[PDB]
Design a protein around this ligand. Sequence first.
Ligand SMILES: O=C(O)c1cc(S)ccc1[N+](=O)[O-]
Ligand code: NA
Length: 123
Amino acid sequence: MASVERDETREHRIETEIIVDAEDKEERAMGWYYYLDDTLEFPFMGKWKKKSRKTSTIEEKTVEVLGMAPDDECLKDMYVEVADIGDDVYTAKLSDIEAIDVDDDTQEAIADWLYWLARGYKF
Ligand SMILES: O=C(O)c1cc(S)ccc1[N+](=O)[O-]
Ligand code: NA
């Protein structure tokens, strides 16, 4: 189900800019992957909530978000590659990233993705 009400501005943009003619799961995933890759301005900084299910703990890491992760798990979720430069590179779910002082378009694209998930939409 949906945890937020429809936002028609986001719906229009998703329809016309992102999903476009996509019909099946792979096409819907691909649309989002290319949109995010095109619209997020890399690199940017974010707080990553890196969770450990086994120990019930959370490490909130401050990282550079370098780009989309290579598209191996594209069908399931949107992943980005992040680095802590204190170099260790990781794969993180975009939905676990809180961007820090980014430009308007990057913030918008992240919000669109968060909105899609909140609505309960899936590829
Ligand atoms: O093959 C790919 O590399 C592929 C990548 C993405 S992001 C989405 C769908 C795909 N399909 O369907 O092939
Ligand atoms: Na980009």
